[PDB]
Write a protein that binds this ligand. Sequence first.
Ligand code: A2R
Lengths: 339, 77, 60
Amino acid sequence: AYGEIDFEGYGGQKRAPYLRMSHDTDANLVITLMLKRWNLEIPNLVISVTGGAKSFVLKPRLREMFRRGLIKAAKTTGAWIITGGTNTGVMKHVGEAVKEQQLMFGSDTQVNVIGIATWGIVDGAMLDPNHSHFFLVDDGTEGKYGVEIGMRSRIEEAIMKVIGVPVVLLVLEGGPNTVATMYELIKKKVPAVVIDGSGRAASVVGFAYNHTIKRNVDGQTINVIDPQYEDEVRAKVVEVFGAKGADKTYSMIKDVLEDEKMISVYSLDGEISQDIDLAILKALLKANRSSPVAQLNLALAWNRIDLAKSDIFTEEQQWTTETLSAAMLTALLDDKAEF
Amino acid sequence: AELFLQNGLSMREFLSLDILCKLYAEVPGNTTIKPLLQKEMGKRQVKTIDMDVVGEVIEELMGDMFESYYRKDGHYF
Amino acid sequence: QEDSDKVWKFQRYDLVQEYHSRPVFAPPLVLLGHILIFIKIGLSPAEMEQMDNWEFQAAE
Ligand SMILES: Nc1ncnc2c1ncn2[C@@H]1O[C@H](COP(=O)(O)OP(=O)(O)OC[C@H]2O[C@@H](O)[C@H](O)[C@@H]2O)[C@@H](O)[C@H]1OP(=O)(O)O
């Protein structure tokens, strides 16, 4: 069953197509379907927003700063927002943020909001009427959640194949499937940005990142938990989210931190006046996988001149006319005089 | 007040009719609004403050046939 | 004279309001226009909320 939902007066004239999927199918067919059969441009960025759906407690200052920065990044870049297909949680707040920030602008202001979810929850939880594309995937009965995680891993891996396209992860206020998507996207070489000081699981990732840093191994010098504060993070991962079966997610959240260049933790109370797009750009320049022209035009779209002077225009990387040409056209047409 | 509004509080749930009339009741005294409200309550012989007196002060203090919404809406009676 | 430009801009409103309500009729025949009279926009509510959202974010 594939087609196009017309939501019954839920805000917006444009309709959103949906596609039933199984996990047996590869992601390359999905990418050539969404770039040719559905007519989407190959973007400068893919943001993947991840958090809670049912259990979701959020601060008003934090929700306003998060939606303002995420809207600013996704509208100045023109990025794909990959979330779940749920009408409650962080997906609902991202959808309401898109709703209040896609109405009454210029006519060429539409953010391709893709939702990867399961067919076993739709009519679990109904679809959010603010998404623009739906990938509903299943293999068994209702209640299965991990096939969403596997498709969200492999489809964004194939986005990185067509690297070509930088894909970033944003994690705030989530549960066990949130950190499961975190692990499966660190497996697919997608860098992640964790909003520390936000909720129940992103605070655990932050408190495992900056409080328990340690390099005591050979084999590319991975990061693990401290033996001093392993009891505190054990009590925090067993008390704050998840009651039973916390051992697999504790070993999994220790294995998330295996690469220092792939996880980034940007708090709220540490830096308020620093926007989330600079955190995304620092994660993409920290992962060291994107092209220099992709880092360059992401710095152009976000007016990040100091990070461009620091880590994009270094000595060892040489620029020419043809690599700087489209960037120069963008900087002229958008009035970027420092660039 | 700003910190309360941007941590845990909404005006929609906080403010009621009695809180608003009390908020106009304990105005300090060095203002213009306490002589204006006491002059209007002297013109109506009512010892307590309600939103109709505040509305008439706002109507005579905007001019040009302004009609304040405390006089017309049932939420402020 | 230090605010002459702005006070001309302010009285231009009064001129526009003086001539916006006049009869839509011939200049020697405006009394005939008063005979033919004798014989500020509102918006949709979702459109008003969209107005309010755009105005509030420009205020932001
Ligand atoms: N994708 C979902 N859509 C709607 N509800 C969900 C979803 N996943 C779980 N839940 C529910 O909410 C309860 C706990 O909610 P959270 O822990 O806040 O959800 P979580 O953060 O683990 O994952 C949400 C998903 O949405 C995205 O953030 C990401 O793909 C992630 O896989 C579960 O007992 C589970 O209980 P139940 O389904 O309501 O009986």
